[PDB]
Scaffold this active site. Structure first.
Site, PDB file in Angstrom:
ATOM      1  N   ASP A   1     -43.104   9.508  44.413  1.00 24.13           N
ATOM      2  CA  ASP A   1     -41.720   9.607  45.145  1.00 24.13           C
ATOM      3  C   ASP A   1     -41.483  10.584  46.071  1.00 24.13           C
ATOM      4  O   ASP A   1     -40.561  10.517  46.922  1.00 24.13           O
ATOM      5  CB  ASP A   1     -40.900   9.321  43.754  1.00 24.13           C
ATOM      6  CG  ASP A   1     -39.516   9.479  44.176  1.00 24.13           C
ATOM      7  OD1 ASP A   1     -38.654   8.520  44.650  1.00 24.13           O
ATOM      8  OD2 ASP A   1     -38.717  10.448  43.936  1.00 24.13           O
TER       9      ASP A   1
ATOM     10  N   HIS B   1     -65.046  11.970  38.493  1.00 18.19           N
ATOM     11  CA  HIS B   1     -64.781  12.279  37.178  1.00 18.19           C
ATOM     12  C   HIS B   1     -63.380  12.820  36.875  1.00 18.19           C
ATOM     13  O   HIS B   1     -62.477  12.215  36.257  1.00 18.19           O
ATOM     14  CB  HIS B   1     -65.777  13.275  36.603  1.00 18.19           C
ATOM     15  CG  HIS B   1     -66.259  13.102  35.251  1.00 18.19           C
ATOM     16  ND1 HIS B   1     -65.486  13.500  34.107  1.00 18.19           N
ATOM     17  CD2 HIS B   1     -67.145  12.351  34.633  1.00 18.19           C
ATOM     18  CE1 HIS B   1     -66.183  13.223  32.780  1.00 18.19           C
ATOM     19  NE2 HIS B   1     -67.193  12.487  33.247  1.00 18.19           N
TER      20      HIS B   1
ATOM     21  N   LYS C   1     -45.761  11.937  49.313  1.00 19.78           N
ATOM     22  CA  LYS C   1     -47.104  12.281  49.676  1.00 19.78           C
ATOM     23  C   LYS C   1     -47.812  11.416  50.433  1.00 19.78           C
ATOM     24  O   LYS C   1     -48.696  11.562  51.320  1.00 19.78           O
ATOM     25  CB  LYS C   1     -48.047  12.401  48.516  1.00 19.78           C
ATOM     26  CG  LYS C   1     -48.354  11.171  47.662  1.00 19.78           C
ATOM     27  CD  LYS C   1     -49.092  11.817  46.266  1.00 19.78           C
ATOM     28  CE  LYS C   1     -50.425  12.311  46.658  1.00 19.78           C
ATOM     29  NZ  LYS C   1     -51.350  12.517  45.506  1.00 19.78           N
ATOM     30  N   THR C   2     -47.269  10.025  50.491  1.00 20.84           N
ATOM     31  CA  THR C   2     -47.572   9.077  51.327  1.00 20.84           C
ATOM     32  C   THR C   2     -46.950   9.208  52.668  1.00 20.84           C
ATOM     33  O   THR C   2     -47.514   8.804  53.799  1.00 20.84           O
ATOM     34  CB  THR C   2     -47.446   7.579  50.757  1.00 20.84           C
ATOM     35  OG1 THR C   2     -45.600   7.723  50.540  1.00 20.84           O
ATOM     36  CG2 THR C   2     -47.986   7.352  49.463  1.00 20.84           C
TER      37      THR C   2
ATOM     38  N   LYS D   1     -37.767  15.941  52.332  1.00 22.33           N
ATOM     39  CA  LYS D   1     -36.616  15.916  52.336  1.00 22.33           C
ATOM     40  C   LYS D   1     -35.609  16.981  52.629  1.00 22.33           C
ATOM     41  O   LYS D   1     -34.562  16.998  52.138  1.00 22.33           O
ATOM     42  CB  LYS D   1     -36.134  15.001  50.882  1.00 22.33           C
ATOM     43  CG  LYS D   1     -36.941  13.608  50.723  1.00 22.33           C
ATOM     44  CD  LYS D   1     -37.035  12.708  52.003  1.00 22.33           C
ATOM     45  CE  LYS D   1     -37.576  11.435  51.827  1.00 22.33           C
ATOM     46  NZ  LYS D   1     -38.797  11.555  51.280  1.00 22.33           N
TER      47      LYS D   1
END
Length: 178
Positions: free
Chosen positions: A18, A65, A21-22, A116
């Site tokens: 949210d 891992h 990071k995308t 933002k």
């Protein structure tokens, strides 16, 4: 440095979905210079390698891992980078913590990416105190946490983000903050 073997500085982008990071990879996807093969969001690939200043910024790690350095190595301090994404007034979500708690103890710097923030400002100081609530004292304040009040959309802070990333590859070679 390369004297003790130049370990590839994997700039692991962490935070939470949210926080955007995308949006970082997406906006940075609109400003690529090298990459691998495909910087598209598909579970065979996605992230890439950026050559700005010609410093090898390999984004995203490979969770074999543990995500961010498998937790079994003290004779091999890897040059892992903790990009810690945030968003305006959110501060730190669950994933923001579990990543930092995991990150901070490898003796590695962490990099707040206030997304933002392209507005006037939600509440930096408050948000920043959330970070230093995990004892991630900003570099403003003299801890070890690089606060990037940026924006990927306006593409202002996107620049400033890599600016701080490479700054790390600079100062960590010397003594970091102190």
């Amino acid at each position: 440095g390369s004297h003790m073997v130049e370990r590839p500085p994997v700039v692991t982008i962490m935070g939470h979905v949210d926080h955007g990071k995308t949006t970082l990879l997406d906006a940075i996807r609109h400003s690529k210079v090298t990459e691998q093969e495909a910087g598209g969001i598909t579970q065979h690939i996605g992230a890439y390698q950026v050559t700005v200043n010609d410093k090898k910024i390999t984004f995203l790690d490979t969770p074999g891992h543990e995500a961010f350095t498998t937790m079994r190595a003290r004779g091999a301090q890897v040059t892992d980078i903790v990009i810690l994404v945030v968003a305006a007034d959110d501060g730190v979500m669950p994933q923001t913590v579990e990543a930092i708690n995991h990150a901070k103890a490898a003796n590695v710097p962490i990099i707040v990416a206030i997304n933002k923030m392209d507005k006037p400002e939600a509440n930096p100081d408050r948000v920043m105190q959330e970070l230093m609530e995990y004892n991630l004292v900003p570099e403003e304040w003299g801890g070890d946490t690089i606060f990037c009040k940026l924006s990927a959309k306006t593409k202002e802070g996107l620049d400033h983000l890599l600016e701080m990333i490479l700054l790390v590859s600079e100062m960590e070679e010397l003594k970091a903050n102190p």
